[PDB]
Write a protein that holds these residues in place. Structure first.
Motif, PDB file in Angstrom:
ATOM      1  N   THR A 245       4.198  -2.674  -4.104  1.00 31.22           N
ATOM      2  CA  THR A 245       3.789  -1.509  -3.337  1.00 31.22           C
ATOM      3  C   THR A 245       3.518  -1.860  -1.884  1.00 31.22           C
ATOM      4  OG1 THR A 245       2.769  -0.506  -5.291  1.00 31.22           O
ATOM      5  CG2 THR A 245       2.173   0.401  -3.143  1.00 31.22           C
ATOM      6  N   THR A 246       2.692  -2.881  -1.673  1.00 31.78           N
ATOM      7  CA  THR A 246       2.202  -3.205  -0.333  1.00 31.78           C
ATOM      8  C   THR A 246       3.252  -3.819   0.589  1.00 31.78           C
ATOM      9  OG1 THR A 246       1.461  -5.516  -0.287  1.00 31.78           O
ATOM     10  CG2 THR A 246       0.234  -3.986  -1.683  1.00 31.78           C
ATOM     11  N   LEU A 247       4.356  -4.291   0.020  1.00 31.15           N
ATOM     12  CA  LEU A 247       5.411  -4.909   0.811  1.00 31.15           C
ATOM     13  C   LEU A 247       6.461  -3.869   1.125  1.00 31.15           C
ATOM     14  CD1 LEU A 247       6.113  -8.255  -1.104  1.00 31.15           C
ATOM     15  CD2 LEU A 247       4.916  -8.003   1.076  1.00 31.15           C
ATOM     16  N   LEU A 248       6.619  -2.930   0.204  1.00 30.89           N
ATOM     17  CA  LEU A 248       7.685  -1.948   0.304  1.00 30.89           C
ATOM     18  C   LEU A 248       7.336  -0.734   1.141  1.00 30.89           C
ATOM     19  CD1 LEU A 248       9.046  -2.105  -3.316  1.00 30.89           C
ATOM     20  CD2 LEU A 248      10.362  -2.551  -1.231  1.00 30.89           C
ATOM     21  N   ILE A 249       6.049  -0.414   1.232  1.00 28.09           N
ATOM     22  CA  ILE A 249       5.625   0.805   1.918  1.00 28.09           C
ATOM     23  C   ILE A 249       5.628   0.636   3.425  1.00 28.09           C
ATOM     24  CG2 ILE A 249       3.133   0.353   1.967  1.00 28.09           C
ATOM     25  CD1 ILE A 249       4.083   3.788   0.860  1.00 28.09           C
ATOM     26  N   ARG A 250       5.706  -0.609   3.877  1.00 28.17           N
ATOM     27  CA  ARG A 250       5.781  -0.871   5.298  1.00 28.17           C
ATOM     28  C   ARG A 250       7.166  -0.459   5.763  1.00 28.17           C
ATOM     29  NH1 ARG A 250       3.213  -4.473   5.909  1.00 28.17           N
ATOM     30  NH2 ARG A 250       2.529  -5.421   3.933  1.00 28.17           N
ATOM     31  N   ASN A 251       7.234   0.169   6.933  1.00 30.47           N
ATOM     32  CA  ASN A 251       8.500   0.659   7.460  1.00 30.47           C
ATOM     33  C   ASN A 251       8.986  -0.179   8.632  1.00 30.47           C
ATOM     34  OD1 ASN A 251       9.712   3.763   8.999  1.00 30.47           O
ATOM     35  ND2 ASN A 251      10.759   1.911   8.278  1.00 30.47           N
ATOM     36  N   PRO A 252       9.856  -1.154   8.348  1.00 29.99           N
ATOM     37  CA  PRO A 252      10.231  -2.142   9.348  1.00 29.99           C
ATOM     38  C   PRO A 252      11.024  -1.532  10.504  1.00 29.99           C
ATOM     39  CG  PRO A 252      11.688  -2.314   7.449  1.00 29.99           C
ATOM     40  CD  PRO A 252      10.756  -1.159   7.181  1.00 29.99           C
ATOM     41  N   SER A 253      11.903  -0.583  10.194  1.00 29.96           N
ATOM     42  CA  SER A 253      12.771   0.014  11.197  1.00 29.96           C
ATOM     43  C   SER A 253      11.987   0.790  12.252  1.00 29.96           C
ATOM     44  CB  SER A 253      13.824   0.905  10.532  1.00 29.96           C
ATOM     45  OG  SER A 253      14.687   0.133   9.711  1.00 29.96           O
ATOM     46  N   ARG A 254      11.062   1.637  11.807  1.00 33.04           N
ATOM     47  CA  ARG A 254      10.286   2.461  12.726  1.00 33.04           C
ATOM     48  C   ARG A 254       9.622   1.636  13.818  1.00 33.04           C
ATOM     49  NH1 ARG A 254       4.676   5.813  11.361  1.00 33.04           N
ATOM     50  NH2 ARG A 254       3.704   5.406  13.398  1.00 33.04           N
TER      51      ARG A 254
END
Ligand SMILES: NC(=O)c1ccc[n+]([C@@H]2O[C@H](COP(=O)([O-])OP(=O)(O)OC[C@H]3O[C@@H](n4cnc5c(N)ncnc54)[C@H](OP(=O)(O)O)[C@@H]3O)[C@@H](O)[C@H]2O)c1
Ligand SMILES: NC(=O)c1ccc[n+]([C@@H]2O[C@H](COP(=O)([O-])OP(=O)(O)OC[C@H]3O[C@@H](n4cnc5c(N)ncnc54)[C@H](OP(=O)(O)O)[C@@H]3O)[C@@H](O)[C@H]2O)c1
Ligand SMILES: C[C@@H]1CN(CC2(C(N)=O)CC2)CCN1S(=O)(=O)c1ccc([C@](C)(O)C(F)(F)F)cc1
Ligand SMILES: C[C@@H]1CN(CC2(C(N)=O)CC2)CCN1S(=O)(=O)c1ccc([C@](C)(O)C(F)(F)F)cc1
Lengths: 265, 261
Positions: A245-254
């Motif tokens: 959850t905590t790694l995936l919810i971060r939005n790298p592109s934005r």
């Protein structure tokens, strides 16, 4: 916004002056407790005078340089504005403003509850802006920090939490914007937005009861991570039971696009 | 659940459509395109004079019908009654296009709290009130709701704090009920549109503080209508291909899928 380049240490909060809202129970209370342990000056707020007192009692036995409570409802912006002023005086300044309170909410389909939508925006979003406006002068004084507590419902879409989620999104849009504004006006006040998964607070557990079976992280650890993040001046913190959850919810592109439009102008 | 087929003008012919904030810019272009398609149209805004001009041109363009009801979306009683009035007039409602926003320029936030409350009331709350008010009719027609938003409603910029707050609010609230509809088997589609710079007169004045290319309002309006007719979840429209491709956040739809099952 430059995060601090070093591991967190409890003494970073020793003698710091911290407001914590929604500090009568749940995560807020735990945060107050942790700050006690670190020798911080603390001011807690919420509506229940009685529960607020018990909190303060414990914060003192735990080693708080000083602990006060001020009761009132964030439904009332005049109160919100005055609270920060009174807390400023109770402590002689402000180093960290922890915004944590939310209006009473539970899991329902949106059956045109326009009233709960408005109350959610007043309590969960608008009062934060008011509290912030009030605290800035002091925070500029101490090169301090603002911590906005938010949720997974404030990053991705879930059913059953429409108003709540609307309000948490609002916090992101607003506070992430001002973060840029501070960068370019070079105001050295840091903003930390915390994105939380299910936490085992009394309120949450009663609300998801039987409606969804999923693991809940401990409120104590959760509260500690909110402080650390705030202390190291991180832009965002992520806390859930799962690392998926905590790694995936971060939005790298934005984050990349934002930076890419900053260099452009 | 969108429609695999391409869009054709006739998907609008005779459809009863509300368009808010339609006295100028993108709003006006939408009423215009709808009229070209033979749709039934009710537009709204505060200024009755200009609304009158939009209506007249819609009839000129082939509108099945074209009427205006003037008011301020700062008023939630008006918003409510506006929807009822428009639907009764037309005989029902197929598509609710929510487009209006409070007057906005480029400013650093400056304890400017009145502007934050108003932006939320007008840009966001009023959308919830119009949706509540339109929903029964939309259920009857299996209609659709189209919410106009912005890049700043998906990523963060300076100079648009209050504005972003409200647009971010739009995405959170509407995406959430879209999932609610999905599971209550309510077939009303919800379309969020993410627009970059459009050469609308009002937008060209707030910036021009910064130079960047601006997409044509006329085309922008059509894309917004297309996406609605097709019942797409989100519409992306910027001049630059790099943005319309980079602003997307695939992980989010992946996560929402994985957390639903
Ligand atoms: N727990 C979770 O699973 C979870 C998950 C994601 C995000 N979060 C975030 O973490 C934060 C705290 O959550 P929590 O579960 O710890 O909440 P909680 O246990 O329900 O506590 C909420 C606090 O806010 C106060 N409050 C309620 N209404 C108020 C009002 N009108 N004016 C002023 N204060 C008011 C309450 O005190 P009074 O009743 O005395 O007013 C209470 O101290 C929230 O921002 C939430 O979004 C929590
Ligand atoms: N143009 C862009 O570059 C751009 C970029 C991104 C997103 N967007 C989005 O696209 C949408 C339309 O943008 P636009 O540039 O075409 O807008 P616009 O030209 O400024 O027109 C806005 C409309 O809203 C109306 N309005 C203003 N205050 C109102 C109120 N209190 N109550 C009811 N109506 C009110 C205005 O008419 P009255 O003053 O007569 O009421 C006007 O019809 C907006 O949602 C905007 O967020 C635009
Ligand atoms: C995974 C959790 C719980 N979800 C429950 C959910 C799902 N997952 O599908 C929607 C059935 C809502 C999304 N998140 S959350 O953002 O952390 C979150 C946790 C708790 C709460 C509140 C305020 O306590 C509650 F609404 F419950 F009253 C709100 C958000
Ligand atoms: C590229 C544009 C303009 N940006 C200007 C910007 C940058 N790029 O850094 C921030 C200096 C803000 C983000 N987008 S936008 O979401 O489409 C957008 C366009 C127009 C408007 C409004 C309402 O007209 C305006 F705020 F100007 F009054 C708001 C948002």
């Amino acid at each position: 916004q430059q995060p601090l380049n070093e591991e967190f240490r409890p003494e970073m909060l020793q003698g710091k002056k911290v407001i914590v809202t929604g500090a009568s129970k749940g995560i807020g209370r735990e945060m107050a407790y942790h700050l006690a342990k670190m020798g911080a000056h603390v001011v807690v707020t919420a509506r229940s005078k009685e529960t607020l007192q018990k909190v303060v009692s414990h914060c003192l036995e735990l080693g708080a340089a000083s602990a006060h409570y001020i009761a009132g409802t964030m439904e009332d912006m005049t109160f919100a504005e005055q609270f920060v002023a009174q807390a400023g005086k109770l402590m002689g300044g402000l180093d960290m403003l922890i915004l944590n309170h939310i209006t009473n909410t539970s899991l329902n389909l949106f059956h045109d509850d326009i009233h709960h939508v408005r109350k959610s925006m007043e309590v969960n979003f608008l009062s934060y802006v008011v509290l912030t406006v009030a605290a800035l002068p002091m925070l500029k004084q101490s090169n301090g920090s603002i911590v906005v507590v938010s949720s997974l419902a404030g990053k991705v879409a879930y059913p059953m939490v429409a108003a709540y989620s609307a309000s948490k999104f609002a916090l992101d849009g607003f506070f992430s914007s001002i973060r840029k504004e501070y960068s370019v006006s070079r105001v050295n006040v840091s903003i930390t937005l915390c994105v939380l998964g299910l936490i085992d607070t009394e309120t949450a557990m009663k609300a998801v009861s039987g409606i969804v079976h999923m693991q809940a992280a401990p409120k104590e650890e959760c509260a500690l991570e909110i402080i650390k993040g705030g202390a190291l001046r991180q832009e965002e913190v992520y806390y859930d039971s799962s690392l998926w959850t905590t790694l995936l919810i971060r939005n790298p592109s934005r984050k990349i696009l934002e930076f890419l439009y900053s260099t452009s102008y």
